[PDB]
Design a protein around this ligand. Sequence first.
Ligand SMILES: Nc1ncnc2c1ncn2[C@@H]1O[C@H](COP(=O)(O)OP(=O)(O)OP(=O)(O)O)[C@@H](O)[C@H]1O
Ligand SMILES: Nc1ncnc2c1ncn2[C@@H]1O[C@H](COP(=O)(O)OP(=O)(O)OP(=O)(O)O)[C@@H](O)[C@H]1O
Ligand SMILES: [Mg+2]
Ligand SMILES: [Mg+2]
Lengths: 358, 358, 251, 321, 265
Amino acid sequence: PLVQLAGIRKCFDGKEVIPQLDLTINNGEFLTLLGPSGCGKTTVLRLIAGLETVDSGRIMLDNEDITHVPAENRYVNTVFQSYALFPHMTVFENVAFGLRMQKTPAAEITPRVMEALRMVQLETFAQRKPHQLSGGQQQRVAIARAVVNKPRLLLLDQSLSALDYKLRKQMQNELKALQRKLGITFVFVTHDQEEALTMSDRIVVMRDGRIEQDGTPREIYEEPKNLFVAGFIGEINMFNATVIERLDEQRVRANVEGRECNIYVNFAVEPGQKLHVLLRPEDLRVEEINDDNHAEGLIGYVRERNYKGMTLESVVELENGKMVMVSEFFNEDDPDFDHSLDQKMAINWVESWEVVLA
Amino acid sequence: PLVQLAGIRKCFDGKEVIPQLDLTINNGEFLTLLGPSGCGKTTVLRLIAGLETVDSGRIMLDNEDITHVPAENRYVNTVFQSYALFPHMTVFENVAFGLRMQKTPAAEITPRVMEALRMVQLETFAQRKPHQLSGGQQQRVAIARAVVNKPRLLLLDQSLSALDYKLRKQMQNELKALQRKLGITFVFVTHDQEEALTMSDRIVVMRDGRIEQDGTPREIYEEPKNLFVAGFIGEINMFNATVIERLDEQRVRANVEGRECNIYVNFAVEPGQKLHVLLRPEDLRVEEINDDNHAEGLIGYVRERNYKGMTLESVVELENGKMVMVSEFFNEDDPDFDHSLDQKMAINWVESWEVVLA
Amino acid sequence: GRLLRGGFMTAIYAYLYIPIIILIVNSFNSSRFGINWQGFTTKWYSLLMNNDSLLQAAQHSLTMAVFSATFATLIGSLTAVALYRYRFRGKPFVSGMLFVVMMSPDIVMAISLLVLFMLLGIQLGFWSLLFSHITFCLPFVVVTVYSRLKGFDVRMLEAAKDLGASEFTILRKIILPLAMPAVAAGWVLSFTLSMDDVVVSSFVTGPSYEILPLKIYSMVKVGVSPEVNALATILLVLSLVMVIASQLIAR
Amino acid sequence: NTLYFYNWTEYVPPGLLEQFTKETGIKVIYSTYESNETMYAKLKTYKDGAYDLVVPSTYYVDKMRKEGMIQKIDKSKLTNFSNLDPDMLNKPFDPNNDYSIPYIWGATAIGVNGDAVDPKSVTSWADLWKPEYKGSLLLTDDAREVFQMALRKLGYSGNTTDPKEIEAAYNELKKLMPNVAAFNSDNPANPYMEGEVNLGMIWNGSAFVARQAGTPIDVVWPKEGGIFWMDSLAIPANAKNKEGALKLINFLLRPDVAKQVAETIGYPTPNLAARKLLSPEVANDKTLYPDAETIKNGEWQNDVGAASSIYEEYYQKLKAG
Amino acid sequence: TSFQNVVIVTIVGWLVLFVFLPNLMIIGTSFLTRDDASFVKMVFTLDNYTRLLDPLYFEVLLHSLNMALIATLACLVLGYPFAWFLAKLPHKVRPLLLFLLIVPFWTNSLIRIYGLKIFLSTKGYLNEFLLWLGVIDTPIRIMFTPSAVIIGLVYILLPFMVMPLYSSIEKLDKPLLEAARDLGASKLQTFIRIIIPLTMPGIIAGCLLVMLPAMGLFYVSDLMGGAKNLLIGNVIKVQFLNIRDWPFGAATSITLTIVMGLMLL
Ligand SMILES: Nc1ncnc2c1ncn2[C@@H]1O[C@H](COP(=O)(O)OP(=O)(O)OP(=O)(O)O)[C@@H](O)[C@H]1O
Ligand SMILES: Nc1ncnc2c1ncn2[C@@H]1O[C@H](COP(=O)(O)OP(=O)(O)OP(=O)(O)O)[C@@H](O)[C@H]1O
Ligand SMILES: [Mg+2]
Ligand SMILES: [Mg+2]
């Protein structure tokens, strides 16, 4: 347990941002923080570092009380969101500031700085001022300045937002390799959810200072725990169900959008409750229904398409008046009626694929 | 043709940044600009606005020459990247600056500002200084400041980067609604490619000041024209092929990675040529082969699997020594089959689904 | 448009420089009340090089100005940084004493400080003059540096602390270059204040540390000879060559 | 040893002091002061600092004997005391030259620019009160000189020490304000060389120096009288080296030294054995060196106790009309 | 924390030693009595304050304040455009011109005033020039008038307004100005709504440093405009060096400082 936060509480001008917070960070861990755009994520990172202090609680690092130790005495480093960059120095001095202040011998200042500059693909911009560069270049300079040292705890706050996709993949791999070879612990703040899910091994979701769900990047997607952590991670369509009869110890009959069907429930249930059934866009199948008679399948009408890349988002309205958000893969060269508009449509789902909640 | 750029050339400190350019922006259009982080997009946006006059060339807005007409006289508005936000004014004054500077009647200032703030979900933050806000709230204020004047041309420079997914979708929908209702032209520069394809009508890809390809959101992703536009818009596998003999036209026999197969080529080809065959990761089929005999397919071994949400990236290495990419839905979880590890399997496509380049 | 701007700037420069040319020219006239030209002569310069009691006044005044300005700018810069950033019990008391110094009628100071030095035993001369030339010239540098410091960007300070920065190094490297013009203005203002003083120094000095402005003011009885114009031309030439050397050599 | 000299900046010429050092091993360290009041205050407050020879005025040679700040001058070993005009020797501010020795003298009188105003049109103090001279008079900025002008116009003595007489002087001076154009704060010849003022108070030596620069400024002796002044040499009563000071006085009483001093600065000299050696036209110029009866039956600015405060308060009130 | 402690201790100690102790003596003297041959005696009186009720002192205070405010405004009006224009020139030239502005000010003030009086007098060079070329038939008289006092005060106290203003102007943030110009602004409205609120500290600093010293300059005014009007400096100087009533001078100085401080609120 490298870092422990117990009972940390913080208020700004009399209003609460973090009421209660218990958190543990270990060694060799990649931890990502996600949230609804304004709950609190930079406040936590600044509290962990030597910036603004805590009203009440305890911060422990390596089983040592550090709650009243300032900056310049903690072995942590940070990458800011506003690119806190010294405007009167070249790139080289910006990168070498951290090395110089720890009395690094003058022999290896240049090779290490040039190594970091090669890592971020900016070896040719060594002697250029910050106001002669652009957004991605400034951000890469900030990353390089933070990673030149060998800190045991690196806090990154939106460090890969101003780069293009192909370069973002290279930086993800670079950071992953550095973590694997050395042993740095990372606290990564982002809003791109796919990068969070690919790249990390614990993901913590927040809402107004409350920890809503903490788990490995697979339970965040496969098994949501509240209704908020289910409608935030991706696209999802919620169905209302009424339990009818308890069939088996893992099978329950329920009337859902007016059709009786079989679902998997793994907790106590009694005929008379209102349950939420959660399905994903890519788990539903659609089939044409030319015949007037309809059996074993929801009826709807397809309204528009989106074509968001490799996937063709499709909206189908039921007679009840609700969207369904059906998704698939776009096969243009396939001529077997990939797309057709304004027709009656049927939608079904494979059993034991849904998620059940109270 | 609302804006016409003819022969624009600009050099910074003696080095070429925009060599030569010819561009046309029409009415009621969504134009998105994509490039590799240093290409020169924001200089183009500044050249359109009154800032940063041209070294040589010519610009028309309708039929009148603005190439030397200063700012304060052009009817365009901009959303900056650095959030150029006044620190001595409230959010309210920041929003109403533009309204007041064109001598609006004093009665309509308050309702228009409050409508603009209700659009961006910041009604309660009306009387707070900028330095008390977060990054996302500052960016939302930046959008609201430019929107509230109702201009004919609106330029956005990474205006949806600091938000989460659900709010970003809402802002995309809101901007599209404004464009449909009023008739504004949008020049929007961004790095999120899925958002670029889902919400645009023309897409311009650039490199080192060159307009490499201009076309509809489908021509970029389905039929690239250059090798750079093929390696920048998404994930792709490229194979080398040599033509053997030409069958009936729209069908050509070629040897690719040691297998003779058919490729659909629609131009003149002579034997002995070397061609590039590009395939998308989702257009490959991977099939298990327990029998020792292999026929009609390239043979290789899977090396790792990646869990990217809703998909399952997989990389396979052939006996040749090359790694190629394959993708499929992973929420096919809870199956019977469909999980495996390092084995021997074959890769096969579906025919006439490839892209062929010289 | 450009023409009017140039006209304004050259008008102010003319207003400030056209009497200096008149002094330089009258340094060569034969009349001892230069209002007209009465011939070309170099008698005044030959008289000055031989006076051997005004040259020492110039040297003493230059040394006083240099040392007083350097220490005043250092102490004032530290005071301004302390008021802006550091947190201690009473700032209003510190601020008020600067205001009182800036409002002293310049006659009461020369008596209060004189009585104080005799009480304390400090010998009158070099040291007494320095300790009075530093005390004033302090509010000017404090006010200038505090005006420049306001509106500072705290992101740089936070990043420097994050990377590890003791108060000395962050002060020096981050604040000193970003607030350098205020420091230079303070230095030149302190220099120009420590050369026109005639009231405080006449009291707080001793039998042998005579300075130049005292001599000029006391010459009013017998008239001010063109000797002082000859001295002023030499000092102006030195000041000009010093900076045309400094700019050309390095920057 | 060494000698400390407290004097005006250029009152004793440089280079002239070099021969004193060549003849005698004494070297002089020279300290200068702005005005007599500063000299009084600095000398009274700083007792630790000791000076060796100081040059007061006619007022301040008095006021410094009664309060011990001045010392007796032993005239036995000043061998050149004969070379001095007896008219300036004995005066009511130093009874027998026991505490001072005259060094430089002068007078104050009406100065007229002959180019613009006829010199013979004005002949007395009272003619400055005529209504035609509106906005064209220059007056000296010190209370005692202006109040002496008024008192001599009325017919009283300069040191009246009677409040009733000062009241009449104040009332008379109140009528002169519409005529005043400036109160002079620097050398009297300076405002005349620029043409600002063509008639008013002036010192005779300044008029001589101004005429020697091409401006014809004549000086006319008022019938009521001329206001006299002189400077003197004295010892500050706390001196480490008294013999050096009393030798310096002897050196300054020589004929050739006096002639050089009177040549380098135009102000008259009290040596009678030295004005003969001067130029024929300089010694005979009647305004610079007036005739004997005017000098001996003259007014000198002696000390009046407790009434100087009245003069200064009235000078304050009169300006802020 | 040691460095901060040392800095604070040094700053407090210097100020207490060289400002507090003399002022305590001043206050103690202000409540005492005049005596010859000692300059002060041991009698407690309040008359040194109740003698300030005559109209003379209030009138001279008002006149001094009027001249100081006029000089301050004139320096502001003549100096703000100078700093703004100079802030636009290339970066290499700026320090050279800054120093060339101040090098005239490194000479004794009295000699400078002598030069100006030679320049502007009736028989000065300006009139002779404007006469030999035609125009100005009779000489233009400008000396010994209240306007000459203002000319001299500006001639002495110009940099004290320029340098604090240039320091504030140099640090202005470019993106804010670009955003304003892009939102449809104009030069006048940009000046009113942005530059002045962001440059006000420089204006306040310059105004203080030109106004407060201006009350002590009573010698340049005396030379350039006669002595036809009194100022507070002459009153205190005569109270100290000519009447030799030191307690009354102390009382006048303390009342002046209190009034000036309260006026600034
Ligand atoms: N100086 C401040 N004073 C008062 N309230 C503040 C201040 N800073 C932040 N707040 C409030 O704290 C809350 C959240 O703080 P914070 O900026 O850390 O959120 P965040 O999620 O990390 O940022 P983002 O929205 O970019 O994801 C916001 O409501 C914000 O308005
Ligand atoms: N002030 C400048 N002086 C000299 N060169 C500059 C300057 N600003 C930018 N450049 C150069 O312009 C090029 C990039 O131009 P531009 O800023 O228009 O695109 P960009 O900001 O990099 O796009 P993106 O924000 O997506 O990264 C860089 O090579 C950069 O070094
Ligand atoms: Mg943030
Ligand atoms: Mg950009």
